[PDB]
Amino acid sequence: PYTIELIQPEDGEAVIAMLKTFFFKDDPLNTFLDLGECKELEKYSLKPLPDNCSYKAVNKKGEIIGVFLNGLMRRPSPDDVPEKAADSCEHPKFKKILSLMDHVEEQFNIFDVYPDEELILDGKILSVDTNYRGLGIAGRLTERAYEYMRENGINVYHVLCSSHYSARVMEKLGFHEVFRMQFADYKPQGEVVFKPAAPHVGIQVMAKEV
Ligand SMILES: CC(=O)SCCNC(=O)CCNC(=O)[C@H](O)C(C)(C)COP(=O)(O)OP(=O)(O)OC[C@H]1O[C@@H](n2cnc3c(N)ncnc32)[C@H](O)[C@@H]1OP(=O)(O)O
Numbered sequence: 001p002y003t004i005e006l007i008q009p010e011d012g013e014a015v016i017a018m019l020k021t022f023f024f025k026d027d028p029l030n031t032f033l034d035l036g037e038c039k040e041l042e043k044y045s046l047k048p049l050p051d052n053c054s055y056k057a058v059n060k061k062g063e064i065i066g067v068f069l070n071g072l073m074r075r076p077s078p079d080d081v082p083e084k085a086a087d088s089c090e091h092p093k094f095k096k097i098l099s100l101m102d103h104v105e106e107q108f109n110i111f112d113v114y115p116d117e118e119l120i121l122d123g124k125i126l127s128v129d130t131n132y133r134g135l136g137i138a139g140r141l142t143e144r145a146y147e148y149m150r151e152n153g154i155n156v157y158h159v160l161c162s163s164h165y166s167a168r169v170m171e172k173l174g175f176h177e178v179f180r181m182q183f184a185d186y187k188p189q190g191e192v193v194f195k196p197a198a199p200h201v202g203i204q205v206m207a208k209e210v
Contacts, residue, residue: 002065002137004144007054011064015049015056016042018064023127028163029100032196033093040094045069045125053121053148057128057137066128068141070148073122073158075111096193101160103188104203108179110158113207121149123159126166139173146210159206163196167204175206 007015024030024041035041048054048071057066076082086098110120123145128137145157159175161167167177182202183194 001060002132003058004055004140005058006052007049007056007067007069009049011056012046012049014064015067015069016045018067018129019045019125019127022129023125026130027127028165028196028200029097029194032194033096035093038091038094040089040091047071048122048124053145055141055144057132057141059132064129065132066137066141067125068123068138068145069125070145071122071124072154073110073120075118076109099188100186100194100203103186104160104179104181104205107181108205110156110178110205110207113178114156117156119152119154120156120158121145121154123157126159138169142170142173149210155209157208157210161204161206163200164202164204165200167206170206170208173208175208177204178207179205 019041024035024038030041048069051071053072054069055067056064059065084099084102086095086102089095089098111117114120123142126138126141142157149155149157157175158178159170161170171177180202183196183200184192185202186193
């Protein structure tokens, strides 16, 4: 028995406490790097909350057992000056993750796929408490976003997945791949950076039109 609720500003600390327990330690890239204390990821996670489209799964006792943090993304302006997220980061491990994200964006722009769309929903952080996994909570979090999308005329939900494991979950939920890159092929300075276990494979950007 759990509820799916909009994350409020006063929920920030509780969301961060939950993420520190699970996501910071068990996202495949975070665990590969042994991220440790990372105020940069805390900042990254809190950023989308004021967009009012992030959701928490809450058990009967009132504890957060899952979150899907989402933000609105807008088509780059005609006069856009693109920035690398990695430039303003002092945490060497998180900088590797941000550099990977920057690289993906250099190679693939979701807005090229959907020329008529100005605003797309971006699924930024998805995490479920270990003891509540395999119960469909990820799907129920995701489905709550469809409500927001309907209410606001948003057609596309975009989710960068850090492993084939999570991409498979999104596939089950009706998303399809729009871009992929193997970790073995990511060599920004000529050498492999990420070498997690073979089943992870690489990143996949997943999309659904709702
Ligand atoms: C944008 C981003 O954040 S990408 C990164 C996504 N987040 C992570 O990788 C963090 C670590 N992983 C997690 O927190 C979770 O595994 C999630 C969020 C990916 C999935 O959440 P869940 O609510 O468990 O999803 P779901 O119920 O669909 O289970 C997914 C699969 O996990 C497997 N599974 C079954 N039981 C368990 C369990 N006890 N523990 C873990 N996995 C299980 C199954 O393969 C299951 O698929 P199936 O039910 O269709 O057969």
